[PDB]
Amino acid sequence: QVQKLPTGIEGFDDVCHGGLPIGRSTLISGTSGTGKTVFSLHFLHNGIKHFDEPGIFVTFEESPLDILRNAASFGWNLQEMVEQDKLFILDASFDLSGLIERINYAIRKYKAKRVAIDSITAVFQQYDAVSVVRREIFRLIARLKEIGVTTVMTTERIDEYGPIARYGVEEFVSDNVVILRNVLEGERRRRTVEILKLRGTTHMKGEFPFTMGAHGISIFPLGAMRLTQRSSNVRVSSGVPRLDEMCGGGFFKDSIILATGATGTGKTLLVSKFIEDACRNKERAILFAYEESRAQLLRNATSWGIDFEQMEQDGLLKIICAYPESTGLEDHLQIIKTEISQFKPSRMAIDSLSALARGVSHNAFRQFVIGVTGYAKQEEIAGFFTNTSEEFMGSHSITDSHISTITDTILLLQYVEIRGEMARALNVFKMRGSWHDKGIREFVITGNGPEIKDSFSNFERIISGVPHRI
Amino acid sequence: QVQKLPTGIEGFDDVCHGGLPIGRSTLISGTSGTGKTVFSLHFLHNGIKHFDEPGIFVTFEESPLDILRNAASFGWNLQEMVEQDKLFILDASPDPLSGLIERINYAIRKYKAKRVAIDSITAVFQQYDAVSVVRREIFRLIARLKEIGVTTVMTTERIDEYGPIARYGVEEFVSDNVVILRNVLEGERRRRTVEILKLRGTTHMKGEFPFTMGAHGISIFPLGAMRLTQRSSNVRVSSGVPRLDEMCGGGFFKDSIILATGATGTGKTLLVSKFIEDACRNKERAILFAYEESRAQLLRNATSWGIDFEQMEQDGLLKIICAYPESTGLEDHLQIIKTEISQFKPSRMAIDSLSALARGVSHNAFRQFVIGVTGYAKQEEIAGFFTNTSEEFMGSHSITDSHISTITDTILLLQYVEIRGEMARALNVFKMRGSWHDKGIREFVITGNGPEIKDSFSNFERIISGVPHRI
Amino acid sequence: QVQKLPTGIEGFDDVCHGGLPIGRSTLISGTSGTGKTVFSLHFLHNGIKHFDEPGIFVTFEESPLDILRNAASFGWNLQEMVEQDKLFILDASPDDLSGLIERINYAIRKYKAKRVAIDSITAVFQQYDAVSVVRREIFRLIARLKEIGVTTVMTTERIDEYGPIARYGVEEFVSDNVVILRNVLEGERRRRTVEILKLRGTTHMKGEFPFTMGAHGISIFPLRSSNVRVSSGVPRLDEMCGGGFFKDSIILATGATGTGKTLLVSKFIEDACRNKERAILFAYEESRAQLLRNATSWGIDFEQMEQDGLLKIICAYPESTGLEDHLQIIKTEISQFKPSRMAIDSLSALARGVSHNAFRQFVIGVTGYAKQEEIAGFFTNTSEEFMGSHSITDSHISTITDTILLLQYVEIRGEMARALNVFKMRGSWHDKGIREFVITGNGPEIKDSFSNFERIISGVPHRI
Ligand SMILES: Nc1ncnc2c1ncn2[C@@H]1O[C@H](COP(=O)(O)OP(=O)(O)NP(=O)(O)O)[C@@H](O)[C@H]1O
Ligand SMILES: Nc1ncnc2c1ncn2[C@@H]1O[C@H](COP(=O)(O)OP(=O)(O)NP(=O)(O)O)[C@@H](O)[C@H]1O
Ligand SMILES: Nc1ncnc2c1ncn2[C@@H]1O[C@H](COP(=O)(O)OP(=O)(O)NP(=O)(O)O)[C@@H](O)[C@H]1O
Ligand SMILES: Nc1ncnc2c1ncn2[C@@H]1O[C@H](COP(=O)(O)OP(=O)(O)NP(=O)(O)O)[C@@H](O)[C@H]1O
Ligand SMILES: Nc1ncnc2c1ncn2[C@@H]1O[C@H](COP(=O)(O)OP(=O)(O)NP(=O)(O)O)[C@@H](O)[C@H]1O
Ligand SMILES: [Mg+2]
Ligand SMILES: [Mg+2]
C-alpha cells in the first residue's frame, strides 16, 4: 500500500520501481559534486511541468539567484515557474521549529506537494550532537509527513565507500535512502546511483552508472535492459561478395559482427567495406574510431579505393574519432548513444573494442559491451565491432575479454607463414541463423580492396599460423 | 537443555538448527536496509499465524501506522491481527529503561504474548547512554525479559559490514544470541547475507548464508543444509538426435545433469533446442532459461534448424525465460529459476548458458549457484541440460574452467577440427555415469533439419588438439 | 547564465571548458608542494598580461619580497607590475574576519582589481575554529567577494592525496568550484595531477590530468596525412615498404636484443642528413660515444652530421626524470632544433618503472606531437623473449604504430641468423617476405626469404 511519485528523471524511476514513496522523505547523500542539488531541482521541475505540482526549495547557503543561474544550462523555464508561483525558493541562510513553521507557511501558501531541502547537514553543524541530530531530523521528517508532502533531503559525505551520511543517524531515521557516488579509479571519474533502502516497497539493488547531460541526469539501468530484441532474416552486404557467399548470402541486418585478429590482418578494411555498402545503398552509417585519426583513415581508405569524404559530403557517413583514455566507459557509451540519435544510422562500426578495454576493469568493459551491443540490437542498427589480439600467431582464443558469446557473426583473420612469407587467411567462424563456408580461405589486400581466394587444402596446422605442407 | 522456537522463516530455522532459543533474547544487528524490521515482523507474524502466539512490537521511531503499511508489501493481514488483539504495537517514540520495561511487561500480560520484538534499541541508547550505561541497561532489559519468559528479538544498527557487530562494542557480549544481517557491495552489486554468530547453550550453522526478500518476506538459501539425497532411476529420455541417443547407450537419463561444453558456434544451443523439442513432442513441459539470446533470436534460429518453439509455447509445453545475467545477482537468479519451475512444474529444464552467469562473479559464488541449481533439479526429479562455452576455440585441455565437471553426470564435448584447411566439427560423449557410451569423436554437420552425426576421424591423430595430422 | 574567465594557464581552460566561473571563488586544495601558490600567481599574472585586469594577492605567511623572489624563476615581471600599480600584495601575516574584508575591499577599489588570490585560508583558521565557525566564516568571505564582483582563487591545505579534499571537511561544500592538486608518490617517483571536481552550473572535464611546472608556470597537457615517402637508408627495405616510409607515419622496429634495431635507427637519420635535413636522436640505452663508435663500425659518420648542423643526439637514462617530464624534454628539443625526422631508442627502456597505463599515455603524447608537427618518427622496442615472441609488444601499442618492422633471430644450421619483415604498413603495399639479413661494416644487407624452411617465425625452423 506504499505508493510512489515519478521524479521524471530517466532511469531513476526504473531503479526505484516507479519512483520515490509519496508523503515520505527521501535522503540523497553524496560527496561534493555528486549531483544532489541537480537531482533535487530535477525532482521539483518535473513535478510542476508534468504533474503541475508546486514545489519548494529550501536553501541554507546557495542564494536563490545562484540556484537559478546554476540551473540555467539544463533548458528549464525555472524563472517563469518562480514568477508564476509554481516554484518557491526559501532562503534560510528553536531554529528547527522556526524553519518548520516557515516551510509549512510556504507549503500552504503555494499549495506545494514536493519539497527539496539542501542541505540539512549545514543546519546540524551549528552545534548538534548525534542524540540531538536524531531527534531533530525525526521531527522535521514527521512534520513533513504531517503536512503531506513528498520530500527530498540532501546530506554530505566525506568518503565514497564509507559512512552514508555524517553522523551515522540520518540513514536509520529516513524511510528512503539514495546514495550518489563519484569514484576515482585510474585517474577517471564514474558517477553512479544506488537505492540503498525504500521502506515498504521494492527497488533495484546496487550501483547504477549515470551521466549529467543536456537536459540533466541520464541514468542507464543495465539491469533494466530486457532480452526481447526483435530478429529478422533480412540480409545486408559486407562489401565483399565472396564474403557474402561465405556468410550464406551476406550478414543479417539484425546482428552483431565481430572481426578479430592480430594487428595488420585487415580488420579496418572489412569495416570500411561494411560502411561503404551502407552509403552505396544510400543509407547512413557511423564509424567510431579509437585507434586511428580521421585523416589517417581517409588516406588508408583512399589507398583501398574507398572515398569516405564523398560519403560524408553526401550526408551518409559520420566519423567520430576519440582516444579511449579521454573519458570513462559510461561517458563513451553516452557519446555513442547521442551520436547515433543525431545521425540515425542503419549501420554502425566500432574500431576497435579492444582499444576501449585498455586500462579498464574487465567487468567495466563487459558492462560497456553489453550496453552498446544491447543498444544496437534494440535500435535495429547493424553493428560491426573490431578486436585486436595480442599474440599475432597461435592465439587459441577469439577474444581476450571473452566476449564471443555476445556476437552473432565472427570473422577470424589470421597470419599464415607460407614458404618464408607472411600470408593471411579469413574464416567465418560463427554465423547464427545461417549456413556459412567452413573454409579458412586465403585473402589478399590490394589497392582495390580484399580478394578472398581458396583454402590451403594441402596444408596442416593452418590455424596455428605456422603450417606444415603435407 | 535449551529448547528452540520455530520462526517459520524459510531457511532461518535450518541455520539455527531448529530456531531461536525459547525464553531468550536474540540480537539482530545490521546496517540500514539489511531487513532487521522485516525479520522482526516475520517472527511475530508467524508466531500468530502458525501457533497462535500473540506478539508485541516495540517501536522507538517508526509509527504503528507506517509499520502496518510497510508490512502490506508482504501480504500479511496484520491489521486484522491488531484488531483481534493478537498483535500489539507499543509506541515508545518521543513524547513530542525501567519505565519501558514495565510497559512491555504489562503489555505481555494483557495480550498473553509469547514473542516480543524491540526495534531499535540503538535509538534509545543514542540519548546519552555510555558504554557502562548501555551495558548495565541492556542487561537489565534482557534479564527481565527472561523473567517474564518471552522469546525476544532485538534490533541494533551498525555502520560497516565487516566491523563492530553493533555500535558500542557491548551489545553482542550481553546478548545470549547474535544474528548479523549484511548487505555487502562487491563490484557494483549488493548481496544480502545472514549469519548466526552465537547461540549460547545450543548449536547452529556457521558463516554467512545468502538470502533474498520476496513477496512472502525473507527467504534464506543455506546450501549447507541441502543434503546429498536425490534419487536415481534407469529411465531414459531422448536427446532429439537418434544417433546421439545411441551414442549415450539408449538416450539420456531422466535423473541426470547433462553438460554440453565447447567453443562458441559449435552447436550447444542446437542440442538444447532438440532436448526441449523432444519433451514437447511427448506432451511434456519444458522451460528454457536463456541468458545470451532473446526469444526473437532464439525462435528465428530455431526455425532455421526446423524447430517451432511458438507452437510449443502455444500448447503450454514450453516457457522461455530470457534475461541478462546482470539483471540480478546469482542468489536472485537461483530464486527466479526455482519459482518459475515451481509454477510451470516442468519435466525438463535448460540453462543456456552457465558460462554467461559466471560473468562478473567470484568462483565460489558461481559454484554455490551450480550446486544449488543442480541439487534442486536432481531433488525435484527434473532432467537438466546445461551449456558451457569454453574460452579457447581449439585444444582446451580442460572440460570446464569453473570445475563443475564432477557435479554433472553426462558430458557432451563439442569441438572444432581443422580438416583440409576447413573448420569441421566433432561430438564426443565424454562421460556417461551409469551407462555405456560411444567413445568416438564423431564428426557432425549442422543443417536446416538439425545435426547430422557422422563417423570418427579414424585416419587422423591429435584430433582433440583441434589441429590434427593425417596418417 | 554562468560565464567563465580564461586563466591563460596552458590546458587549465581546456579542462575547465572555458576557465573559472566569473565573479565566484574557486578552491584550490592540495598537499604541500603541489603548486597552489604558483597556480594562484599564474592566475593574477596572466590577468594583467593578457586581459589588463589588475590582481590582488592575499598572503598570511609568505612575505611579499619572498613571493616576488619565488616568482622570479618563471620570468614573471611582477616587479614592474607592482610598480605600475597592477599587482598588489596584501600582507596579512602576523607580526579578524571583518577586518580582512574591508582591507581587500579597499585594495580592490584602489587598484581596480578584477582578480584576487587568497593563500592560504587554512592558515587564517589555524588560530581556532570549530566546523560550524569555519563554514560560516568562509561562507561570508565568499558571499562578500561575490558582491564586490571579483573572481577569487582560494588555497587550502590537505594532509593526504586521496583523503579529504580540505582539512575541516566543510570548505568543498561551501565553495562553488573546487580544483584538486595532487603529487602522488608511486614507485619512489612523484607525479603531479590536476582535477576539476565541481563547477556549479557548468561543465568540466572529469578526472585527473597530469601537469608539469616549467619555466613559464604550469603546463597541463590533456588528451592531415600525406603520401610523401622518405627513405630508410636501405634501398631493399625501401622496396619492401613500397617505396620507403611515409613522412607522416610512426615506424616501430620490434625485435630481440642484438637484432639490429639501432642499426636501422642509424641508417634512418643518416639518410636525413644525406638529404641535408635535420634530425634528432633520443637515446636511453647507449652513450653518444658508444653510439659514435658503433656507428663508425657500421660506416656511419655521426660526428660530421652533428658538426654540419643536421643532427642532434640527446642521451639520458630513463630514470633521469619521469614520463611527463621526458615528454617535455622531447617537445622542447624538437622546437629548438626543428627536425625533419625524430628517433627514440628505445621506447622499451622508457617503459621501465612506469605503469602500463602510465606508459601508454607517453606514447600517445609523443606519437601525436610528431604527426602534429609533421615529423617522421622511428621508434624501437626490445622484446623480452629472444625467440618465439608471438607478440609484437607486451605494452599493446601496435595499433598506435603505422609501420611495423619485425626483426628476429633464426636458427639455420647450428648458427644464429637474422631476419626482418615489414609486418604492417598502413596505406601501402609491402613485401610479405621474412627476409634474411646480415650486419656488416658497410651496414645491413637484406637477402632472400627462407622458402625451403617452415616455422621461421618460431625461430626454430624445419628444413623441408
Ligand atoms: N515487499 C518487499 N519485497 C522486497 N523487498 C522488500 C519488500 N519490502 C521491503 N523490502 C526491502 O526491505 C528494505 C527495508 O527493510 P527493513 O527491515 O525496513 O530494513 P532495516 O534493516 O530495518 N532498515 P533500518 O531501519 O534503516 O535499520 C527495503 O529497502 C527493501 O529493499
Ligand atoms: N594499397 C595497399 N595495397 C596492398 N596492401 C595494402 C595496401 N594498403 C594497406 N595494405 C595492407 O593492409 C594492412 C592494413 O590493414 P588494416 O585494415 O589497417 O588492418 P588492421 O587489422 O585493422 N590493423 P590494426 O588496427 O593496426 O591492428 C597493411 O599492413 C597492408 O598489409
Ligand atoms: N541453417 C543453418 N544451416 C547450417 N548451419 C547452421 C544453420 N544455422 C546455424 N548453423 C550453424 O550453427 C552455428 C550456431 O550453433 P549454436 O548452437 O548457436 O552454437 P553455440 O555453441 O550454442 N554458440 P554460442 O551461444 O555463441 O556459444 C552457426 O555458427 C552455424 O555454423
Ligand atoms: N547546468 C549544468 N550543466 C551541466 N553540468 C552541470 C550543471 N550544473 C552542475 N553540473 C555538473 O554537476 C556538478 C555539481 O552538481 P551539484 O548538484 O551542484 O552537486 P552537489 O552534489 O549538490 N555539490 P555540493 O553542494 O558540494 O554537495 C558540477 O560539478 C557539474 O559537473
Ligand atoms: N662490424 C660489425 N660486423 C658485423 N656485425 C656487426 C658489426 N657491428 C655490430 N654488428 C652486429 O650488430 C649487432 C648490434 O645491432 P644493434 O642495432 O645495436 O641491435 P639492437 O637490436 O639495437 N640491440 P639492443 O639495443 O641491445 O636491444 C651486434 O650484436 C652484431 O651482431
Ligand atoms: Mg549542492
Ligand atoms: Mg585497425
Ligand SMILES: [Mg+2]
Ligand atoms: Mg528498521
Ligand SMILES: [Mg+2]
Ligand atoms: Mg604555497
Ligand SMILES: [Mg+2]
Ligand atoms: Mg638498441
